[PDB]
Amino acid sequence: DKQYISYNNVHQLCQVSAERIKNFKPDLIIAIGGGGFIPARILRTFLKEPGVPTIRIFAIILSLYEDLVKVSRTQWIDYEQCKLDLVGKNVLIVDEVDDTRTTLHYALSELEKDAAEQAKAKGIDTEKSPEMKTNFGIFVLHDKQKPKKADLPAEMLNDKNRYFAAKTVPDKWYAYPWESTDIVFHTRMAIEQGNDIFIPEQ
Amino acid sequence: DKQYISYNNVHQLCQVSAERIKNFKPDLIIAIGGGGFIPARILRTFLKEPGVPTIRIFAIILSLYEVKVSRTQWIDYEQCKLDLVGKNVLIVDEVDDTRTTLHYALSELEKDAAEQAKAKGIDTEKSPEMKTNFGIFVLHDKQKPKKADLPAEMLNDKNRYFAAKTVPDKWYAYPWESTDIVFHTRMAIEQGNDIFIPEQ
Ligand SMILES: Nc1nc2c(ncn2[C@@H]2O[C@H](COP(=O)(O)O)[C@@H](O)[C@H]2O)c(=O)[nH]1
Ligand SMILES: Nc1nc2c(ncn2[C@@H]2O[C@H](COP(=O)(O)O)[C@@H](O)[C@H]2O)c(=O)[nH]1
Ligand SMILES: [Mg+2]
To answer: Which residues does the annotation say bind GMP (chain A)?
Structure first.
């Protein structure tokens, strides 16, 4: 039962989620794919504080292939060039949907390798110096209620201030507005399905 | 006279612009900042051909200071296996105001292209066809005195410089910038800045 989601719905999902995510105090955002970036950018509008430098967003692409799951960093982050130091940072990973969780699992896994390798380059010892550890969190618009094919750490999933889903939803296909080649039809369906705005004008 | 722009307006600006941009045949897109990335991603939906790998989008951030250019977030070409040689590259931003941002973005990316051509032992004078072809797409190009220029072969080629709309010198409020999307959309509708293409 295909669920059509309007732009304004996504906007308001980000709006309400931002209030929760403030408790995580993200220092930067890493967005998975084009679908991750749009919510990430909208989120930033709601995280912005006047006089405070806007939170940086980094786009990454992960490709996963059948093993004999193999992971390829199709588009990654040049931490040195960007002067991005993950040590002692709160990092929010953003994607539009958590379906089987495979993508989020391997993205987190890869980013943890980056952080560990940086904390070692600095002659930092994350065991002796725990406060230099990187704190990862996740934000998705939709977390599907279904058997997952991959896990996420318990301290992530079971911490309401680390794993953030705007909505936990049935196992249905979600059609995002940026994916549509007929936004008029798409928005008409979204309104009919109750997938448009849910917060009134201020 | 602030102009409120709805999400659906942005979507349809990209839809019509894609028909023009197909003539440029972009191989990849480079999006400037968060405001560039959204139209870039929407454009990709309209450039997609089934059975053909999706066009890659790379995000960059340029900082310009009182001009001093800083590559705040750039592209690791080697890591991304991105070769600009012989490519048609579309640079995307949401707005061309004074043109300063586009001027320096193009300048910096051209340096990358030349650098990569030389590393491949390619004399672009002798083999002009291997040169990198840059194009630009913005949602709005403001009609006003510009503070920087773009190449004549860019600006005067309808198949290189693409503005969805050429507009008066007013401030454009994009939907992703809004903290009240309901007010924002109501204003956009009133202003005639919503949809302009019917359902299929
Ligand atoms: N548009 C859309 N894409 C989905 C949906 N479910 C999964 N996907 C795509 O499948 C990918 C893999 O999701 P995963 O199963 O790894 O969590 C997602 O990144 C997304 O690209 C959906 O309901 N709607
Ligand atoms: N939202 C919005 N931003 C603008 C507008 N005009 C200029 N800007 C911001 O100013 C930046 C510099 O524009 P430039 O003058 O270099 O073309 C743009 O990238 C954009 O971030 C506008 O009308 N609306
Ligand atoms: Mg995604």
So the answer is: 70, 95-103, 144, 173-179
